[PDB]
């Protein structure tokens, strides 16, 4: 995997012709409100990723169409991707013909690091559960299908319970048909995922890190459902299932959303992203491209030195910030133009 050229037209506040990153570690330097985040977001969207920003707010003030173009070559061969952003909607042209967005899901792609991960680590229960679901959903579609079916079955049973009576065991069996599969898949994924995260975080700090997932229905959905009939009758809602699990991150055996500072939480988020990158690279055979935003803002000297050491052994990566790391190629951004001395 290697990126060769990136060109754009009327994207955010950017104004440039071409950009050719070298193979290996790179860097960007710029003051406030210059376009580093815009450039990284544009690259991530061009390579087939998902941008949290709305589609209608990715163009200039006054214009009504945007253009993106990237040229990437892999172990197989080179190919060109192109996006036409506009009022109608996104469209993709791989090598010159219309292609569905689901096709790019088989390509290597790239991973982006942003403070949103830090926000997700220190968030409520639902945000952590949603993060786990989205992370697992990138390795299989069966998980998404099972989640949709389980949600529909749960809605049906809750609607039945809310008013009146009818045949109930059928919906119980229907929901238990999917709950066990979801639980088993989650258990297997966590078992395969934990040691990589531990060994990745062991090279960035000194303390211990881990994961924990407590289940309301471990033995089986049917047994737990038949053991809480009175509570369901009183409340009127289902109280057991995979839709009520809890995921907790541990630092030295304590929850990370009550006994953690900014630096440790940022290190945990970076470790999670790096572990996901490593696992995805092992899965597809060719590791994706890594883009880091604000690499060393809220960190001290030792942590910054540790971060720079790890990223030096990767195939290709791009870092951005307000300062230039020592000993790496540097490019500057001024009001949207990228010039490389």
């Amino acid at each position: 995997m290697r990126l060769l050229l990136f060109r754009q037209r009327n994207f955010r506040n950017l104004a440039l012709e071409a950009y050719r990153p070298p193979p290996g570690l790179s860097a960007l330097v710029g003051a406030n409100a210059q376009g580093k985040t815009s450039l990284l977001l544009g690259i991530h969207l061009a390579l087939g990723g998902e941008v949290p920003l709305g589609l209608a707010d990715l163009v200039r003030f006054g214009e009504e169409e945007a253009w993106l173009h990237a040229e990437v070559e892999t172990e197989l061969g080179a190919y060109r991707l192109e996006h036409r952003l506009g009022p109608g909607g996104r469209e993709v042209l791989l090598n010159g013909k219309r292609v569905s967005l689901r096709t790019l899901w088989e390509l290597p792609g790239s991973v982006l690091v942003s403070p949103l991960d830090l926000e997700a680590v220190l968030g409520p229960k639902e945000e952590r559960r949603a993060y786990l679901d989205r992370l697992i959903a990138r390795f299989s579609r069966r998980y998404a299908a099972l989640l949709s079916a389980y949600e529909k079955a749960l809605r049906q049973r809750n609607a039945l319970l809310k008013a009146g009576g009818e045949g109930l065991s059928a919906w119980d069996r229907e929901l238990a048909r999917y709950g066990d599969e979801i639980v088993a898949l989650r258990r297997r994924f966590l078992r395969r995922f934990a040691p990589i995260l531990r060994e990745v975080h062991a090279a960035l700090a000194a303390k211990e890190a881990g994961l924990r997932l407590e289940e309301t229905a471990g033995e089986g959905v049917l047994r737990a459902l038949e053991a809480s009939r009175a509570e369901e009758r009183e409340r009127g809602q289902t109280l057991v299932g995979p839709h009520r699990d809890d995921l907790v991150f541990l630092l030295e055996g304590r929850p990370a959303h009550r006994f953690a500072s900014r630096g440790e939480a940022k290190t945990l988020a970076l470790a999670l992203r790096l572990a996901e990158h490593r696992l995805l690279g092992e899965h597809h055979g060719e590791p994706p491209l890594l883009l880091v935003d604000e690499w060393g803002e809220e960190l001290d000297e030792a942590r910054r030195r540790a971060v720079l050491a790890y990223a030096q052994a990767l195939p290709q990566a791009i870092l951005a910030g307000l300062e230039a790391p020592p000993g790496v190629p540097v490019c500057s951004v001024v009001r949207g133009v990228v010039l490389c001395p």
């Binding site: 892999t74 197989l76 061969g77 190919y79 292609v99």
Partner: peptide, 16 residues
């Protein structure tokens, strides 16, 4: 695979 990848209309996985 490299030769078949360059022609338009075929993705990298399609060539394999």
């Amino acid at each position: 695979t490299r030769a078949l990848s360059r022609l338009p209309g075929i993705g990298p996985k399609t060539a394999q």
